[PDB]
């Protein structure tokens, strides 16, 4: 099972440097190169560089002087480091592996790391219940308010509840802080039997909240 | 660098129809093009390599053709799970470069939203802010209007909307409209109403509550 797992999303101050770790399994870094690709609003999908099996690196032209890729074959880890970030370096960063050892056909991707370049500070969210109230289908949810930066993960009943779930895109408030709601529809008859918990995780602030949502 | 131009920007079809994506290169690149699919909150997924070659685990309804500068990715019978963005990649010339992507939207029958309104929790009121949430669930098409009224006064500028991407199973959207008040303003009023207009409703639907009960 070929897999690539990246370190968590986070905030980097302007002019500061970015570090991401890509841990691979199901293959050996001595047999495959690992590529780095980002995806930004300004420039879309953008190939950044690669570290080959034998330790050599290639960097895309506009990144030659501020990009550094290293790895530890023993630990199956590839280390990405970019210097002097500005606002338009805000993007999702992926590590990726090609089908063959020499190629660029990216058949396996990491889950991505959203990096926000901002001078502001990290802030964890407050979680508030969206309580169901009086055709046999009830809607309930959680309000995840006033956090920075993106993203936040939301799940229901520790992953067991996925059907009917809608987690809305976050919106930026005038405060410069994000907010979103996650909703789910369930049978009215289950409100007295089943517990409904939204599991909220804001990794950039290490804030994890389980919010029980009950009829008021 | 090779410039890759994808067209159209947005594609919109019905399930079971065939659909094609175009990718054009600023100079000949042989057959050195790859295609990717990106679903909502997902990483790119490799669909085709070298213009026409299959990829393990990719459904047979995906195919590609072309050589030189004009390339085509095709889905011969679209399904709802194909709702995604699609990108091409060239690697005939260093560095490898990607197109800007084409969005694939699916049509479906009109579906009216189910409307729910949520008062602010007492927990949030402790903080000095009141959020009133109106939910429009599982509707199509995307266009809809939310009008807020507090004690018959039209609210303007103090609400924000967020819409999900299309559901991969039923192709509907859901919308949340959040009205934000100071706790002081919220306590000075009684009737909080959300009015929803949509093509699937013969009349606007209004969900409301009185602060308290």
């Amino acid at each position: 099972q070929v897999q690539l797992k990246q370190s968590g999303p986070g905030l980097v101050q302007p002019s500061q440097s970015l570090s991401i770790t890509c841990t691979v399994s199901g293959f050996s870094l001595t047999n495959y190169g690992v590529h780095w690709v980002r995806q930004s609003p300004g420039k879309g999908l953008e190939w950044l560089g690669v570290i080959w099996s034998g330790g050599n690196t290639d960097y895309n032209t506009p990144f030659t002087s501020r990009l550094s890729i290293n790895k530890d074959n023993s630990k199956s880890q590839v280390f990405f480091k970019m210097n002097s970030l500005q606002s338009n370096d805000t993007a999702i960063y992926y590590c990726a592996r090609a089908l063959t050892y020499y190629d660029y056909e990216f058949a396996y991707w990491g889950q991505g790391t959203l990096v926000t370049v901002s001078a502001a500070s990290t802030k964890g969210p407050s979680v508030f219940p969206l309580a169901p109230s009086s055709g046999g289908t009830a809607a309930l949810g959680c309000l995840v308010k006033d956090y920075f930066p993106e993203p936040v993960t939301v799940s229901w009943n520790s992953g067991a509840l996925t059907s009917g779930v809608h987690t809305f895109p976050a919106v930026l408030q005038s405060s410069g802080l994000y907010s979103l709601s996650s909703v789910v529809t369930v049978p009215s008859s289950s409100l007295g039997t089943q517990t409904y918990i939204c599991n909220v995780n804001h990794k950039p602030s290490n804030t994890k909240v389980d919010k029980r949502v009950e009829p008021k | 660098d090779i410039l890759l131009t994808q067209s159209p920007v947005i594609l919109s079809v019905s399930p079971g129809e065939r659909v094609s994506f175009s990718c054009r290169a600023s100079q000949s690149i042989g057959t050195n093009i790859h295609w990717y699919q990106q679903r909502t909150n997902g990483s790119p997924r490799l669909l085709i390599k070298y213009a026409s070659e299959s990829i393990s685990g990719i459904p047979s309804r995906f195919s590609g053709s072309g050589s030189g500068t004009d390339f085509t990715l095709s889905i011969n019978s679209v399904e709802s799970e194909d709702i995604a963005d699609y990108y091409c990649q060239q690697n005939n010339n260093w560095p490898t470069t990607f197109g800007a992507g084409t969005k694939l939207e699916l049509k479906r029958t009109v579906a009216a939203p189910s409307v729910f309104i949520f008062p602010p929790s007492d927990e949030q009121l402790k903080s000095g802010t009141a959020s009133v949430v109106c939910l429009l669930n599982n509707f199509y098409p995307r266009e809809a209007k939310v009008q807020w009224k507090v004690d018959n006064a039209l609210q303007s500028g103090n609400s924000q909307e967020s819409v999900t991407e299309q559901d991969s199973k039923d192709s509907t959207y859901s919308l949340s409209s959040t009205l934000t008040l100071s706790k002081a303003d919220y306590e000075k009023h009684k009737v909080y109403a959300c009015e929803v207009t949509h093509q699937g409703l013969s009349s606007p639907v209004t969900k409301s509550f009185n602060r308290g009960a």
Partner: peptide, 12 residues
């Protein structure tokens, strides 16, 4: 037409 970091989807 632009990539949206909130949804990883193209928006305008």
């Amino acid at each position: 037409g632009q990539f949206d970091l909130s949804t990883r989807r193209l928006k305008g």
